[PDB]
Design a protein around this ligand. Structure first.
Ligand SMILES: CC[C@H](C)CN(C[C@@H](O)[C@H](Cc1ccccc1)NC(=O)O[C@H]1CO[C@H]2OCC[C@H]21)S(=O)(=O)c1ccc(N)cc1
Lengths: 99, 99
């Protein structure tokens, strides 16, 4: 589809058998999701933006479905104020910027 | 143009007669630039990102050309990790997400 940017580009996603809302964020290198208790191992990470850094848990090879488009890659989990789909997964669904 | 997301969507902008690089950031409501001298009146505001809130200077009705496309809108100036072009200007240049 085509998504205009008059409002936040929020879409439904499916991850670990849960449905959530997340932003398609070209400014996010990597996907970051609200605190959720995912299974399996993980590595600590720190990600920075406006205001400083937050600590997150990095899971790899996580399967996510975004508007029926499947992807699999890194998902960071932590106390983020918003769920964002980052470039690492936006590439996998063929998402482009156009003007 | 069409911009894929395998790398950061960085583009050259012209503001206050100066060239700079900036990130097209669909996850930003607002446009936030690193510290710089801008002619015009400004107002103190706060803006919050993933890591908390920062102090910025709000410049209204600023002319800014993004990748050869003119926009006139609000520009926040402050200690952001990187220049980001947010939706308030992305809408002006006709930018959409497509997959
Ligand atoms: C360094 C590039 C850019 C700032 C990075 N950010 C993504 C960005 O889209 C955030 C994503 C974001 C959206 C909402 C809350 C917190 C972060 N937007 C943002 O900070 O925008 C601010 C400016 O406009 C305002 O509207 C939104 C907040 C204000 S981020 O949230 O900090 C981020 C950093 C690393 C990863 N892997 C994923 C996300």
């Amino acid at each position: 589809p085509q998504i205009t940017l008059w409002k936040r580009p929020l879409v439904t996603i499916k991850i670990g058998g849960q449905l959530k809302e997340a932003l398609l964020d070209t400014g996010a290198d990597d996907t970051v999701l609200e605190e959720m208790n995912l299974p399996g191992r993980w590595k600590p990470k720190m990600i920075g933006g406006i205001g400083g850094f937050i600590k997150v848990r990095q899971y790899d090879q996580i399967l996510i479905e975004i508007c029926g488009h499947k992807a699999i890659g890194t998902v960071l989990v932590g106390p983020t104020p918003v769920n964002v789909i980052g470039r690492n997964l936006l590439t996998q669904i063929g998402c482009t910027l156009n003007f």
